[PDB]
């Protein structure tokens, strides 16, 4: 009768007949209301005052059948039990320490529908795989071109914010991988729009130069367990080994390589030879507009570096390393795409380009993960291909240079695994080594 107060969810907000700490009446909404995230504390309020409610807030998705294939370490098990006392807050570990396992173990404990929100696409791939291995369940995906909504779902921060009202009341547990992005002015609202009571945050860099990480208690909760890299410094792979091998040009290459290089040395010096300065490089470009021999000059310079970057020795060096490391799956990275076909045609191993059918790419990737293929080539130049599968070793051949952003992603994508990673990078000792090795860039 008149001893029942309404408490309902509506498009990212919480609605109620009666006041509660945090609510504010709205003539527009015709109820006391605030953003959805205040659901948890208002429910406990009404319950503490012994007030009977007709609660309609969480319309959960069904928590699926899983098998917990996770056996945590000591500090990992301390991490789960630290979160469990309040079921809210930020766990803090360095890369590789198993932030994912900590979360997916909590998933197995809570046994409630869970949404896991990640900043980038490379991270959707990692999370999808680890939920299959560690929980024996293929999670739904909202992002990366994929739209499936399941009892466990991986989603980007952007799709989360785009769909917040749609999904605000559907997952009781809410995981924020890479949580330091959350206090940003936009995702602040995204966090508040979910009604989820149980919310987990994961980060290696909890602190924020903006100082905006002070929003953690109102968005996810406080830090509940932290260990610095020095604080434990064990039982996990602490880095990825870099090896930068250099191989000399072919006998036939070196010949044409220098001849064209000497044709430039004579002409470029004939009229205004200034090098390594960008302004001088366009000087040659502007000259080559009208001069027939000046364009040929720039042609030979490209032809020289081409003979370097695509040196058939770099391929020959790959046969050595692939022969000499056959313990586990190897992934070859090449900026160039036509040069990737050479590696495929020579060694009879599958190739993946940016213009590869998603159907094909699925075969070549799922059989790789399964372990039908041992060694695979890829060319992520134009359509930036996220480092989809984890492995033990990866060879990068980009001679003219690797984006340290790209280079570091390969580290973190390898870093999270429990076994030490080895990263080879084959630079030719010609024009590439002479011009790239001048600046260290560490």
């Amino acid at each position: 009768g008149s001893h029942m107060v309404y408490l309902r969810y509506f498009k990212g907000l919480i609605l109620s007949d009666a006041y509660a700490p945090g609510l504010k009446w709205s003539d527009e909404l015709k109820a006391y209301s605030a953003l959805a995230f205040k659901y948890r504390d208002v429910r406990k309020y009404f319950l503490e005052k012994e007030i009977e409610v007709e609660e309609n807030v969480i319309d959960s998705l069904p928590f699926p059948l899983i098998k917990d294939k996770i056996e945590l370490r000591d500090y990992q098990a301390e991490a789960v039990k630290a979160w469990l006392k309040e079921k809210r807050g930020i766990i803090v570990l360095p890369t590789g320490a198993g932030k994912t396992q900590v979360a997916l173990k909590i998933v197995s404990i809570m046994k409630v529908a869970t949404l896991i929100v990640v900043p980038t696409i490379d991270l959707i791939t990692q999370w999808k795989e680890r939920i299959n291995k560690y929980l024996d369940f293929d999670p739904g995906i909202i992002g990366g071109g994929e739209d499936s909504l399941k009892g466990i779902t991986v989603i980007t921060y952007d799709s989360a914010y785009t769909r917040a009202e749609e999904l605000g009341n559907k997952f009781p547990l809410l995981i924020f991988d890479e949580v330091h992005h959350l206090p940003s002015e936009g995702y602040s609202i995204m966090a508040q729009l979910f009604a989820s009571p149980y919310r987990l945050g994961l980060t290696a860099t909890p602190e924020r130069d903006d100082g905006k990480h002070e929003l953690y208690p109102i968005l996810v909760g406080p830090i509940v367990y932290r260990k610095s890299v020095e604080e434990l410094a064990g039982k996990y792979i602490a880095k990825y080994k870099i090896k930068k091998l250099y191989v000399s040009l072919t006998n036939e290459e070196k010949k044409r390589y220098d001849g064209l290089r000497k044709k430039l040395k004579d002409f470029l010096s004939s009229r205004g030879l200034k090098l390594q300065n960008l302004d001088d490089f366009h000087r040659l470009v502007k000259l080559a507009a009208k001069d027939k021999e000046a364009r040929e000059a720039l042609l030979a310079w490209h032809e020289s570096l081409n003979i370097a970057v695509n040196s058939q020795s770099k391929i020959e060096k790959l046969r050595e390393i692939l022969q000499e490391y056959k313990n586990e799956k190897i992934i070859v990275f090449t900026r160039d795409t036509q040069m990737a076909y050479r590696i495929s045609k020579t060694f009879l191993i599958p190739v993946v380009t940016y213009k590869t059918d998603k159907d094909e790419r699925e075969e070549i990737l799922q059989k790789f993960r399964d372990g039908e293929y041992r060694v695979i080539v890829a060319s992520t130049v134009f359509d930036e291909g996220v480092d989809v599968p984890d492995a033990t070793l990866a060879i990068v051949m980009g001679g003219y240079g690797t984006k340290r952003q790209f280079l570091q992603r390969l580290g973190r994508i390898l870093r999270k695994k429990d076994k030490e990673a080895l990263l080879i990078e084959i630079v030719t000792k010609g024009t590439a080594d002479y011009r790239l090795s001048r600046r260290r860039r560490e």
């Binding site: 076909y341 045609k345 213009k355 094909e360």
Partner: protein, 479 residues
């Protein structure tokens, strides 16, 4: 088919000035043409032309490459689907030495029965190979660019006006063949074809059609066209693309000149046999109302009644609506036949008969016979040669019909003028003016001539008394 991302042009005031290629771009055109020689991968053509991507405009370089590629002939597809070649071939994982490699190639080459290596990537455009080099001149490459670029800007056109004087007949029915949407006008004798901006779903096929009709216009002695391009996202604004009798335009597409339609010729035929009550003219003379030509397909005639018919090619809600409202000043009924396409439920009209694949003469009649069943108001043809004058009651008397049915159906005869309640031959009346009676009264003199007062009233008549017989103050006068 040339990408927008490769369209290069400039804007001054309200005109879009296209950056056409000139003979300053011949050294460029040559060096690219030189690279398409037989036995070369076009995937490695992309590596070669990098240095030219810096020295000149990258939009002009790539646009040439796409055009030359389109005219090359390549090794045709593999007898085995390249996906299955790779699925079967790559099964042996990493193979290092060439002799084991030589073994495995032989092994699957026998298992599938074809040269694996030559076809393994045949489906990937990077690993193509030119068998027949292109035969385009460096100079005809430049004209063919300037037409590909021209057709590219037009593909984003609000409308397209084609100013024509002599070629009036041909380009129209070719457009009618192509199935375009347009309005014709008579002040400069223009045709304002709707640009592919109007369509949405099949625009790529519509724009290809309009692209076809353009080509026929450029191959002429003199021509003038103006297109309206709508540009701007936050601040939209219409610009003009004016071009008249331009030189650098050579086409390398062969339209095959099919010169007939499957629905159109099937329309003129299917009606001749299954509807014989009507006698249809093939191509009615172009009607012109409010300085605008409204070319109908054909006119059909059930005796006196004559209606115009037009079967349209492409449809859209706003187009038919705007047309029938524009043809609402046609003073004659119309029927419009539309191809079944994206637009749905467009046949819910008085003139809308939406065909599917060919002309169905059956469905035309159900409306053609409905328009005469609806005209079931008895109008009986009659002739009158005046003895002295023809009376409406007399015309009723002779016919043994009641006066009313004649009164409703009154007809106009070239012989006579119709003063109310009578007729009068125009020769009899023209002489009766020379009689020239100034004024009279009492209606006694009317009996001598014996006709109605209506005749007297038309020329110079006035009366201030409603009663006629034994009626005071009856008088007519000039003043």
């Amino acid at each position: 088919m040339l990408p927008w991302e490769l369209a290069r042009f400039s804007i001054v005031k309200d005109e879009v000035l296209p950056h056409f290629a000139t003979n300053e771009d011949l050294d460029l055109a040559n060096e690219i043409i030189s690279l398409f020689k037989a036995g070369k991968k076009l995937g490695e053509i992309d590596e070669e032309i990098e240095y030219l991507e810096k020295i000149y405009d990258h939009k002009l370089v790539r646009a040439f490459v796409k055009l030359l590629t389109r005219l090359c002939e390549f090794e045709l597809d593999s007898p085995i689907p390249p996906i299955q070649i790779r699925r079967e071939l790559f099964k042996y994982g990493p193979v290092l030495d060439e002799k084991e490699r030589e073994d495995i190639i032989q092994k699957v080459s026998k298992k599938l029965g074809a040269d694996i290596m030559r076809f393994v990537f045949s489906d990937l455009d990077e690993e193509k190979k030119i068998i027949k080099a292109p035969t385009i001149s460096a100079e005809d490459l430049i004209r063919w660019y300037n037409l590909s670029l021209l057709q590219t800007l037009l593909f984003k056109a609000y409308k397209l006006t084609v100013y024509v004087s002599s070629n009036w007949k041909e380009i129209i029915r070719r457009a009618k063949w192509l199935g375009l949407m347009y309005f014709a006008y008579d002040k400069p004798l223009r045709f304002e074809f709707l640009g592919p901006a109007t369509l949405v779903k099949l625009t790529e096929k519509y724009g290809r059609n309009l692209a076809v009709l353009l080509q026929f216009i450029i191959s002429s002695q003199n021509w003038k066209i103006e297109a309206e391009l709508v540009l701007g996202k936050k601040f939209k604004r219409v610009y003009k693309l004016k071009l008249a009798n331009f030189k650098e335009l050579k086409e390398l597409v062969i339209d095959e000149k099919r010169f007939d339609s499957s629905v159109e010729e099937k329309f003129y035929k299917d009606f001749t046999n299954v509807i014989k009550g009507w006698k249809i003219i093939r191509e009615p003379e172009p009607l012109v109302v409010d300085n605008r030509v409204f070319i109908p397909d054909f006119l059909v005639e059930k005796g006196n009644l004559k209606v115009y018919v037009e079967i349209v090619g492409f449809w859209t809600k706003e187009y038919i609506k705007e047309k029938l409202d524009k043809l609402k000043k046609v003073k004659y009924p119309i029927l419009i036949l539309l191809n079944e396409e994206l637009g749905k439920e467009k046949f819910n009209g008085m003139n809308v008969i939406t065909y599917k694949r060919k002309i169905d003469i059956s469905l035309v009649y159900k409306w053609l016979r409905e328009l005469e069943n609806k005209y079931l108001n008895e109008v009986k043809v009659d002739y009158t040669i005046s003895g002295d004058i023809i009376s409406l009651n007399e015309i009723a008397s002779k016919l043994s019909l009641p006066v009313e049915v004649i009164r409703k159906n009154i007809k106009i005869f070239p012989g006579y003028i119709f003063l109310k309640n009578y007729y009068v031959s125009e020769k009899f009346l023209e002489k009766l003016r020379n009689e020239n009676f100034d004024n009279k009264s009492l209606k006694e003199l009317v009996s001598a001539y014996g006709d109605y007062i209506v005749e007297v009233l038309e020329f110079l008549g006035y009366k201030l008394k409603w009663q006629g017989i034994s009626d005071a103050i009856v008088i007519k006068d000039k003043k």
